[PDB]
Design a protein around this nucleic acid. Sequence first.
RNA 1: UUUUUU
Length: 412
Amino acid sequence: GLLSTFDTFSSRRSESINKSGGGAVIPGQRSTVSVFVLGPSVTDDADKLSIATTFLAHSLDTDKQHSQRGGFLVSLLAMAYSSPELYLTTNGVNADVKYVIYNIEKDPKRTKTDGFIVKTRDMEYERTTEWLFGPMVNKSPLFQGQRDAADPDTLLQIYGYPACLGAIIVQVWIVLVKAITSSAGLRKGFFNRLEAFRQDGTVKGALVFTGETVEGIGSVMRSQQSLVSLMVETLVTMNTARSDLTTLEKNIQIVGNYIRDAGLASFMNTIKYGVETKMAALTLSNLRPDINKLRSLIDTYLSKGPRAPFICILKDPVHGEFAPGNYPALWSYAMGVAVVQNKAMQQYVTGRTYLDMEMFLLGQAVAKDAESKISSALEDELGVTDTAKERLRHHLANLSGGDGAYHKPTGG
RNA sequence: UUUUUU
């Protein structure tokens, strides 16, 4: 009643101050990026794969400007579509850069640059063509090479060019999985993510990115928010509901299911361990303002729609409010609960200036305690006999010692 | 600011 205004002030203040300015938008500074699409002249699968590998090798070049490397990655991702310019128009609209679409055209008469020529409408460019299809020194190998490994040409005549292009593009997306939010665990995380695809057969051994390629692609993604926006846009605006989804689009949706909520790890896990567990420690007043904050944050997330999982890799305006430093006691509690209840969360960096050590240790204590972690909420539905309740406590005691041992917060 | 897993 009287205290209703204070309880709803977090949600009301967030709605009141996050209202967008609106009106006309002043355009800012944007780089002009050359994106190369394949014209109908390039009907050779081998030529198409060579162009894809050239795009990938140009993206990796250190000397090339990051925006241009991002445009080579954009070219590569547009190769997956029959109309690449339609793809760039629907998913390529951003204020970060202006995409200048060039066409790669294959001419039998011209053997000057591998039978290729870059032409925009009537005009044809040779300076750009020698730059793009010229001999470029690879700082590091583009793909991993192993003994007794099927060659790409053999793999391309056996598995179609869609399969090879899908391998390459899926791997670019797998890079995005951790390029932005975990830049130090990008190589390990890439090969961990890539392991499912390799067993699946989506990525064959001849087209598996090297670590250097993964590091190079991740740097371009960290610098180019336009490329990340195009990928996030492709994931959101893709018509997943329609059954007719290309193997590549299906795999991109898999990778994007891995990209969802990157950077929001603490928000998601705070909800999962701090409030979803529903332990008696939630009755503390330390967590009450942070529970209100998290309630408003859930509304902010669920209002952001399908782009809510990407607010942190996209550097969204509201993304900084999902930072745990806005709900540090509830976050520390949930982090304690999570390091006890989840093995994987013990490698999550919880050693932070705002880690409430008493809330952290309290989460560990209630998560480790049999009386604390058993709820009567579901006992009526389950029809639990008192012998079973006592039996459950006996099982918990045997399964976990909980002899006053705490998890130290993992540092960065 | 980010950082686990999937």
